[PDB]
Amino acid sequence: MKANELREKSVEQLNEQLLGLLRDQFNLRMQKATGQLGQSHLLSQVKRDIARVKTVLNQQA
RNA sequence: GGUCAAGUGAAGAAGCGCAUACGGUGGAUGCCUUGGCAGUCAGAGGCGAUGAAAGACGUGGUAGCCUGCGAAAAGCUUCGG
Numbered sequence: 001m002k003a004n005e006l007r008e009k010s011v012e013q014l015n016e017q018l019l020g021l022l023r024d025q026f027n028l029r030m031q032k033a034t035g036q037l038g039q040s041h042l043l044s045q046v047k048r049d050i051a052r053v054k055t056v057l058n059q060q061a
Numbered sequence: 062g063g064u065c066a067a068g069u070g071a072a073g074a075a076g077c078g079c080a081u082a083c084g085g086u087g088g089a090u091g092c093c094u095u096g097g098c099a100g101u102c103a104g105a106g107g108c109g110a111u112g113a114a115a116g117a118c119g120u121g122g123u124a125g126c127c128u129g130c131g132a133a134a135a136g137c138u139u140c141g142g
């Protein structure tokens with residue numbers, strides 16, 4: 001999720017973008033706990049998405 | 062071919078010694094180096110309340126330790142190769 005596409009939004013709909021990833025990061029950890037996870041790379045990929053949204057969310061001022 | 066007497070006296074090693082040939086233990090010697098020591102020529106001579114030097118705990122798809130990072134956590138954004 002490139003930061004270039006992230007600057008096209010506003011703080012109002014970037015904050016829901018961050019909430020959407022927290023669902024996704026949570027759901028992936030519930031699958032990992034039960035052992036029924038097949039897309040293992042998605043754990044480290046979702047972590048990077050939240051960090052990038054929080055990066056752009058700090059630049060608006 | 063006998064009987065007797067006198068004399069003489071090889072081998073026979075429980076274990077051991079020396080020599081030699083093969084092993085075992087052990088780690089020397091030789092050769093080697095990703096580690097040190099001592100100079101010369103430069104650098105820049107401080108870091109810290111914008112939180113230092115030194116750490117604890119966490120951070121990975123899976124157990125530990127080291128090396129990096131800090132709930133944005135072996136990384137996030139922009140430039141340049």
Ligand SMILES: [Mg+2]
Nearest residue numbers: 083084085086
């Ligand atoms: Mg020998």
Ligand SMILES: [Mg+2]
Nearest residue numbers: 101102103104
């Ligand atoms: Mg000098």
Ligand SMILES: [Mg+2]
Nearest residue numbers: 126127128129
């Ligand atoms: Mg460590």
Ligand SMILES: [Mg+2]
Nearest residue numbers: 051054132133
């Ligand atoms: Mg934060």
Ligand SMILES: [Mg+2]
Nearest residue numbers: 139140141142
């Ligand atoms: Mg580039």
